[PDB]
C-alpha cells in the first residue's frame, strides 16, 4: 500500500515534469535552425594513424595541450602519444589488462585508467626518477570503471557499473562524494567546462546532471530508448549530447530540461560508443558500431560527414581543446587523427 | 614448311594465351590485394609475393615466343641476361613461395599455438625477404653466365658455363630438378598431407555433412594445388632429363613442340596460381561478396 | 632537433618493449570463465574485481578470467571479452530449475554481436549430482523440459562404463539443449565444445587445451583462407 | 522515458486463465525482442517467454510450454501473455522485460534484480 | 623455364 | 518490503527536487545554442578548415 502510494506519487511527479517540459517546448531546435545554412560536406581525412596498441582500444582522452593524448587498450597498456609526430611518449603497463576508460589530467602530470578491476589507477607522469608509477589506486567502486575525468590533480570523478559515480580525493584515496540515482550501469561521464556540474549517461536510458560539490542529481534527462554508452557536454555547458545503443544521438539542454534534437538515420541501426562536440559545438561527432564515425550537424540533425576509417568497432572519440583534430580509437587496435 | 609454320603459330598462340592469363590474373590479384585487402595477414603477403613472382615469370613469355618465331635472339645480351635471369630467379621465388604457403598452412594446422607467433605478418615479410634473397644465389650466377652466341647463322641466348661446360650444365640441371621440383614437391606433399591428416580430427562445422563438406573442399583444394604443381612442373623437368640423358633427335617438330608445351605448362603453373590461391581463398571470396554486396 | 631525436629514440624503445610484450601476450591464451553461482566454475581446472587463474598444458599458458566483483548486469562488461580465444561456460547440469537460465545466458552469449565469433567450451558440471538426481527419481526433467519426454539418446552418444541409460539420456538431453542454440546460429565462425564433468575431474585443463587447439586451428584456417 | 506498464494480474483459481497486458512507451516497440519474466515469492527472477521483433520467433520456458502464449501487437505497442491452465507454482510477480538493445537476438540481463527496461510487474496469484 | 636449354 | 519502499521514497524525493527547477523555453535555449555556434564558428577548425600552415597535422 505504501509502495503503491509512492509509485503513484512518482507517476504524478513524472507527469508533472513531462507537462512542464511540454509547456516549455514552444518550438523545436529543427525549426529555429531551419533557416541557417548547412555546414556543407565535412570531409575529414586521416592525418596520423597511431599504431602500437596490440589489442582493442577502449578509451582515449586528449590532453589540454591538444597535442598529447592517452589511449587505453586491453593489451594492458596505456600509451601516451605525441600526436603531432606519432611519437609514443609513455607506455604504462597496467596491473589489470581489462581497462575500459582513461583520462588525461588538465595539468598533464597525471593519467588515470580503470576497468574490470573496479579501481581507478592514477599514474604520475612527472616522477623524480622519470618512470611512470602508480601514484594512487582508487578502490571503492563495486562495479567496473567505465569513465573517469580529472577536475585537477587532486580530484577525479569516476563512473562505474555499480550504478554510481564518485568524486575522489586522489591524495586521500577516498570517495569524497558518491553520486547515486542511476538504476543501470553508468557508462560515461562528461565534466562541464566550469567543472561545477557533470552529466552521466547510464544503462537505464537516462542521463543525469549532478552537482559536483552539492552531491545530488540536479536533473534527469530521458528520451533515449537504450543504454547510453556515451555522453559529452556542449562547449557552453548549457547542453550535452548522448550516444546510445538505440542508434540515435540526442542533444539535451540543461536549462530546458528536455531533448532538443535526435540525430538518427534509417540505415543506422547500430549503437553509439563515443560522442564529442567540435569546438563551437556545431559538429557532433559520434563513433558507432558499424566501424564508422558520423559527423552530425548539431543544429540541423544532418549527417555532415562520415569518418569511415576503421576495420573494427569505434570505441572512443575525442576532440582537441583547440578544436584542431579528432582522435578516433577503435577495436582494430588503432587511433586515427582527423581534420 | 606449312606444317612447321602452323606448329610455330600454335606454339606462339599457346605462349600468348598462357602469358595473357598469367599477367591478367596476377595483376588482378596484386590490385585486389593492394587496394582492398591491404596485406594485413601473413597469407596475404605470401599471395602477393607469389603473384609478383608469377607476373615476373610470365613477363618473359613474349621474349621466348619471339625467340621461337624468329629462331634467334634479337634483343641483345643485356636483355639476354635479364630475361634469362628473371626466368630463373622468379621460377625459384614462385616455387619457394608455393612451398612456403604449404609450410605456412602446415604450421597453421599442425602447430597451431606456435602459429600464433610464427604466422605474424612481420615474420611473413622477413620470410619472403629471405626467399627473394635466397633465390638471388641462383639469380646472380645466371646473370653472369648468360651470353649471346652465334650458332647456325643465328644468335642464341644461352648460359656460358665454366669449363667443363657439359659438367656444370648437367649439375645446374640436376640442382634445378632437385631444389625447384623434387625438394619443393616433397615439402609441399608432406606439409599438406600432415595438414590433411590433422584436419580429419578438427571439428570444422557443426553436423556430419557440413563438416565433411568443408573438409572435402579443403582436401580438394590441396589435391588440385599439388596436382597442378606436378602436371605443370614435372613435364618440363622430365623433358630436361630426357634431353640431357637420351640422344633424342633435337630437331624433330614433335620434339620441339612437346618441349614448348612443357614450357607452357611450367608457365601455366604461374598462370593458374591466382586461381588456386586467390580465387579459392575464402577471405578473398568474402571480400568479393562484400564488394558485390 | 636533439630533443626531437631523443623523443624518436624514446618512442622506438617504447615500440620495442611493446613488441616484446605483445609477443608474450600473443603466447598466452585468454579465456573467459562464465557460469552461475551453483555451477562450480571455480573448481573446474583446480589451480577484488576480476580474478585470473593461470594454468599450463603442453607448454601452452592459459589465463582464465572469472569476472567477480560485478553486478548481475553483464551486457556491457562482457564486450571486453571480444578477443578471448574461448568462453568457458560452466553449467550446473543437476540444477534443472536454473538450466533454462543457463540456456538463456548461453543464448545471449551465442548471439551477441561482440561474442558471435568466440567459441564456447561448455562444461556440463556436476554430472555426479545429475546422475544421483536421475537415479533418485524425485526431480523430473519433464517438469522443466517437456520435450525430454520425446527425447531419445543419440546414436553418437558415448556413455561412461556402468552408466544408467536414463542418466545418459538426461546428460545428452542437456547437451542437446545447448547444442540446439549453438547450431541454430553462427555456423562457421564459432563452435560449442560440450564436456561432461564432475567436481573430482582432473582432465578439464586437457579438455580446454584440446578445444582451444581446435579453435586456434580454425582461426588459423580462416587466416589462411582455407576455411 | 522507457516505460513498461503491466496489468491483467490478480487472484485466479487453479486451472484458470489470465491475460496479462503490458503497455510500452518511450521506445519503438517493433525494434525490440520482448520478454515475460517472473519472480515467485522467495525466488529469483525467472525468465518465462520471449517473442522476437516481428513476432515470429517465440520461445517459452519449459514449465509454461503448452500453457502460456506470448504475443505482441506492435501497432498498439502492447505485449500479451495468455496464461491458460494456471498452476499454484505460477503464483509470481510477472514483469514485462524489454531486451536492452534494438535489432538484436541476444537478450542480456532481463532477469537481473535491478534491470532497467523492465516494468514494475503485476501480481498473479494462483490459489483456491 | 626450358626455353633456353 | 522495506528496501523497495526506501528506494521509492528516494525516487519520489529526487522527482520532487527535479520538478521544482526553473525551466526556460526550448526556443530560448535553442537560440542560445545557435548563438554559441555562430559566435565560435570561425574559431572551430573542424567547421572552417584552416590552411595547412596553421594545421599541425598537415
Ligand atoms: C624485386 C626484383 C627486382 C625482382 C627480379 O626480377 C629480380 C630481383 C629483385 N632480384 C634478382 N636477383 N637475381 N635476379 N633478380 C631479378 C632481376 C633481374 C634483372 C634485373 O635487371 C638488371 C639487369 C641485369 C643483367 C643485365 C641487364 C639488366 C637490366 C634490365 C636490363 C634486375 C633484377
TrEMBL record, chain B:
Superkingdom as given in the UniProt entry: Eukaryota
All copies of domain G-protein coupled receptors family 1 profile, residue ranges: 25-277
Segments traversing the membrane: 5-34, 46-66, 86-108, 129-150, 170-197, 218-246, 258-280
Location of the protein in the cell: Cell membrane
Gene Ontology terms for molecular function: G protein-coupled enkephalin receptor activity
GO BP term, example: regulation of mitochondrial membrane potential
Entry GO CC: neuronal dense core vesicle; plasma membrane
The entry's keywords: Cell membrane, Disulfide bond, G-protein coupled receptor, Glycoprotein, Lipoprotein, Membrane, Palmitate, Receptor, Transducer, Transmembrane, Transmembrane helix
Principal location class: membrane
Membrane topology field: Multi-pass membrane protein
Family: Belongs to the G-protein coupled receptor 1 family.
Protein name: OPRD1 isoform 1
Residue range from the parent sequence: 42 to 334 of 372
Amino acid at each position: 500500500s505504501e509502495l503503491d502510494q509512492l509509485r503513484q506519487e512518482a507517476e504524478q511527479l513524472k507527469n508533472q515534469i513531462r507537462d512542464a517540459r511540454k509547456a516549455c517546448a514552444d518550438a523545436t531546435l529543427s525549426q529555429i535552425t531551419n533557416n541557417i545554412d548547412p555546414v556543407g560536406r565535412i570531409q575529414m581525412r586521416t592525418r596520423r594513424t597511431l599504431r602500437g596498441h596490440l589489442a582493442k582500444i577502449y578509451a582515449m582522452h586528449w590532453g589540454t595541450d591538444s597535442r598529447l593524448l592517452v589511449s587505453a587498450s586491453q593489451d594492458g597498456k596505456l600509451i601516451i602519444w605525441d600526436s603531432y609526430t606519432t611519437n609514443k611518449v609513455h607506455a604504462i603497463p597496467l596491473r589489470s589488462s581489462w581497462v575500459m576508460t582513461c583520462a588525461y589530467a588538465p595539468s598533464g602530470n597525471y593519467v588515470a585508467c580503470g576497468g574490470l578491476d573496479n579501481i581507478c589507477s592514477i599514474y604520475n607522469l612527472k616522477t623524480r626518477e622519470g618512470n611512470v608509477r602508480v601514484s594512487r589506486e582508487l578502490a571503492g567502486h563495486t562495479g567496473y570503471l567505465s569513465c573517469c575525468r580529472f577536475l585537477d590533480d587532486n580530484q577525479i570523478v569516476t563512473s562505474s557499473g555499480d550504478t554510481t559515480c564518485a568524486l575522489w580525493d586522489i591524495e586521500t584515496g577516498q570517495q569524497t562524494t558518491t553520486f547515486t540515482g542511476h538504476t543501470g550501469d553508468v557508462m560515461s561521464l562528461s565534466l562541464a567546462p566550469d567543472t561545477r556540474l557533470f552529466v552521466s549517461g547510464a544503462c537505464d536510458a537516462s542521463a543525469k546532471l549532478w552537482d559536483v560539490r552539492e552531491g545530488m542529481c540536479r536533473q534527469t534527462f530521458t528520451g533515449h530508448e537504450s543504454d547510453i554508452n556515451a555522453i559529452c557536454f556542449f562547449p557552453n555547458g548549457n547542453a550535452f549530447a548522448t550516444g546510445s545503443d538505440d542508434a540515435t544521438c540526442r542533444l539535451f539542454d540543461l536549462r530546458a530540461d528536455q531533448e532538443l534534437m535526435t540525430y538518427s538515420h534509417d540505415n543506422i541501426i547500430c549503437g553509439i560508443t563515443s560522442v564529442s562536440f567540435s569546438k563551437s559545438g556545431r559538429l557532433l561527432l559520434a563513433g558507432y558500431d558499424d566501424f564508422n564515425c558520423n559527423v552530425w550537424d548539431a543544429l540541423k540533425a544532418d549527417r555532415a560527414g562520415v569518418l569511415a576509417g576503421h576495420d573494427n568497432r569505434v570505441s572512443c572519440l575525442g576532440v582537441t581543446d583547440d578544436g584542431m583534430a579528432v582522435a578516433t580509437g577503435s577495436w582494430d587496435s588503432f587511433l586515427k587523427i582527423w581534420n | 614448311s606449312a606444317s612447321s609454320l602452323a606448329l610455330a603459330i600454335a606454339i606462339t598462340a599457346l605462349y600468348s594465351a598462357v602469358c595473357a592469363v598469367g599477367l591478367l590474373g596476377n595483376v588482378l590479384v596484386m590490385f585486389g590485394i593492394v587496394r582492398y585487402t591491404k596485406m594485413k595477414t601473413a597469407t596475404n603477403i605470401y599471395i602477393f609475393n607469389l603473384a609478383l613472382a608469377d607476373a615476373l615469370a610470365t613477363s618473359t613469355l613474349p621474349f621466348q615466343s619471339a625467340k621461337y618465331l624468329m629462331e634467334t635472339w634479337p634483343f641483345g645480351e643485356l636483355l639476354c641476361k635479364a630475361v634469362l635471369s628473371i626466368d630463373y630467379y622468379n621460377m625459384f621465388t614462385s616455387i619457394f613461395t608455393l612451398t612456403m604457403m604449404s609450410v605456412d598452412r602446415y604450421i597453421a594446422v599442425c602447430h597451431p599455438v606456435k602459429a600464433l607467433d610464427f604466422r605474424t605478418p612481420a615474420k611473413a615479410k622477413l620470410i619472403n625477404i629471405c626467399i627473394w634473397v635466397l633465390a638471388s644465389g641462383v639469380g646472380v650466377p645466371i646473370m653472369v653466365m648468360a651470353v649471346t652466341r652465334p650458332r647456325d647463322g643465328a644468335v642464341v641466348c644461352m648460359l656460358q658455363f665454366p669449363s667443363p661446360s657439359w659438367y656444370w650444365d648437367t649439375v645446374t640441371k640436376i640442382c634445378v630438378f632437385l631444389f625447384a621440383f623434387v625438394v619443393p614437391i616433397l615439402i609441399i606433399t608432406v606439409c599438406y598431407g600432415l595438414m590433411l591428416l590433422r584436419l580429419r580430427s578438427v571439428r570444422l562445422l557443426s553436423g556430419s555433412k557440413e563438416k565433411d563438406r568443408s573438409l572435402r573442399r579443403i582436401t580438394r583444394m590441396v589435391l588440385v594445388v599439388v596436382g597442378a604443381f606436378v602436371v605443370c612442373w614435372a613435364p618440363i623437368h622430365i623433358f630436361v632429363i630426357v634431353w640431357t640423358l637420351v640422344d633424342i633427335d633435337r630437331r624433330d617438330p614433335l620434339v620441339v613442340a612437346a618441349l614448348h608445351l612443357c614450357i607452357a605448362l611450367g608457365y601455366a603453373n604461374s598462370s593458374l596460381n591466382p586461381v588456386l590461391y586467390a580465387f579459392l581463398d575464402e577471405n578473398f571470396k568474402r571480400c568479393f561478396r562484400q564488394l558485390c554486396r | 632537433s636533439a630533443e626531437d631525436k631523443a623523443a624518436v629514440e624514446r618512442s622506438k624503445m617504447i615500440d620495442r618493449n611493446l613488441r616484446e610484450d605483445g609477443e608474450k601476450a600473443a603466447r598466452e591464451v585468454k579465456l573467459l570463465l562464465l557460469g552461475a553461482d551453483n555451477s562450480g566454475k571455480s573448481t573446474i581446472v583446480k589451480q577484488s574485481g576480476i580474478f585470473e587463474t593461470k594454468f599450463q598444458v603442453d607448454k601452452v599458458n592459459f589465463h582464465m578470467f572469472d569476472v567477480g566483483g560485478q553486478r548481475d548486469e553483464r551486457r556491457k562488461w562482457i564486450q571486453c571479452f571480444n578477443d578471448v580465444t574461448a568462453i568457458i561456460f560452466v553449467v550446473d547440469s543437476s540444477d534443472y530449475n536454473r538450466l533454462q537460465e543457463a540456456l538463456n545466458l548461453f543464448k545471449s552469449i551465442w548471439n551477441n554481436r561482440w561474442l558471435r565469433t568466440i567459441s564456447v567450451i561448455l562444461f556440463l558440471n556436476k554430472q555426479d549430482l545429475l546422475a544421483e538426481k536421475v537415479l533418485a527419481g524425485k526431480s523430473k526433467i519433464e517438469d522443466y523440459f517437456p520435450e525430454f519426454a520425446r527425447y531419445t539418446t543419440p546414436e553418437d552418444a558415448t556413455p561412461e562404463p556402468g552408466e544408467d541409460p536414463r542418466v545418459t539420456r538426461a546428460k545428452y538431453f542437456i547437451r542437446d539443449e545447448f547444442l540446439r542454440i549453438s547450431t541454430a546460429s553462427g555456423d562457421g565462425r564459432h563452435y560449442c565444445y560440450p564436456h561432461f564433468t564432475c567436481a573430482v575431474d582432473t582432465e578439464n585443463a586437457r579438455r580446454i587445451f584440446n578445444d582451444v587447439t581446435d579453435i586456434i586451428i580454425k582461426m588459423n584456417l580462416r587466416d589462411c583462407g582455407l576455411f | 522515458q522507457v516505460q513498461l506498464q503491466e496489468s491483467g494480474g490478480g487472484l485466479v483459481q487453479p486451472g484458470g486463465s489470465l491475460r496479462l497486458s503490458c503497455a510500452a512507451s518511450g521506445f519503438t516497440f517493433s525494434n525490440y525482442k520482448m520478454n515475460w519474466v517472473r519472480q515467485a515469492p522467495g525466488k529469483g527472477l525467472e525468465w518465462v517467454s520471449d517473442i522476437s521483433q516481428s513476432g515470429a520467433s517465440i520461445s517459452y520456458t519449459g514449465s509454461v510450454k503448452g500453457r502460456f502464449t506470448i504475443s505482441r501487437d506492435n501497432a498498439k505497442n502492447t505485449l500479451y501473455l495468455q496464461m491458460n491452465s494456471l498452476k499454484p507454482e505460477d503464483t509470481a510477480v510477472y514483469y514485462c522485460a524489454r531486451c536492452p538493445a534494438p535489432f538484436t537476438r541476444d537478450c542480456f540481463d532481463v532477469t537481473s534484480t535491478t534491470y532497467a527496461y523492465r516494468g514494475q510487474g503485476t501480481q498473479v496469484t494462483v490459489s483456491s | 623455364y626450358x626455353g633456353f636449354x | 518490503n522495506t528496501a523497495s519502499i526506501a528506494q521509492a521514497r528516494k525516487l519520489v524525493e529526487q522527482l520532487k527536487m527535479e520538478a521544482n527547477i526553473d525551466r526556460i523555453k526550448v526556443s530560448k535555449a535553442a537560440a542560445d545554442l545557435m548563438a554559441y555556434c555562430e559566435a565560435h564558428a570561425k574559431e572551430d577548425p573542424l567547421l572552417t578548415p584552416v590552411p595547412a600552415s596553421e594545421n599541425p597535422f598537415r
